[PDB]
């Protein structure tokens, strides 16, 4: 360190809006959003700043972007969402924020996945619970034929099994 602090943080304003979001550069990201219409701008793989923030677990950036009009419904080129990226990592608070925006939860991506199948695959119990409560469909299958219960069973995830089964048992039998 030549000065009092590192110079690296002061060079951070050359980063793209996606990298700002990913790395949690709140000040430079906020300023960049004020001055240009860039909050929903996509990079070469169709990823938005919110996707990058979600995928890297940047809770404060996610909150800031949602509070400032970032569209949480957009999908990347692989048909991935901020929701599915966060579900993949088990970032429960990010997932909660996104679910509270009323995003779709059953979009089938080109990897053969859904947020629920990623949450199950990762053994992220709280995400699985929240997703089931927001209407996530446990019968949707991966490319190999595995639904959410199938994955939970095959992978040995006991708590995820219990959660899914309770949910299914809460479904009222049709009597009409």
């Amino acid at each position: 360190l030549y000065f009092q602090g590192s110079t690296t943080p002061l060079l951070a304003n050359s980063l793209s809006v996606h990298q700002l979001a990913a790395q949690g550069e709140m000040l430079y990201l906020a300023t960049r959003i004020e001055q240009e219409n860039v909050i929903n701008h996509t990079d070469e793989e169709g990823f938005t700043p919110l996707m990058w923030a979600a995928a890297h677990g940047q809770i404060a950036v996610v909150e800031f972007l949602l509070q400032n009009g970032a569209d949480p419904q957009l999908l990347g080129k692989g048909r991935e969402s901020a929701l599915s990226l966060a579900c993949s990592k088990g970032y429960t608070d990010i997932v909660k924020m996104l679910l509270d925006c009323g995003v779709d939860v059953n979009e089938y991506d080109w990897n053969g996945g859904t947020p629920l199948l990623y949450a199950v695959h990762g053994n992220h119990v709280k995400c699985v619970k929240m997703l089931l409560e927001s209407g996530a469909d446990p019968t949707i299958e991966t490319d190999s034929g595995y639904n959410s219960m199938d994955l939970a069973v095959a992978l040995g995830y006991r708590s995820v099994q219990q959660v899914i089964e309770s949910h299914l048992l809460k479904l009222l039998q049709n009597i009409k």
Binding site: Q19, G113, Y118
Partner: peptide
């Protein structure tokens, strides 16, 4: 410095 986008997991395999 740049960080990568994590890739979505392969659902055809056990995670471990």
């Amino acid at each position: 410095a740049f960080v990568h986008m994590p890739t979505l997991p392969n659902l055809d395999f056990h995670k471990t």
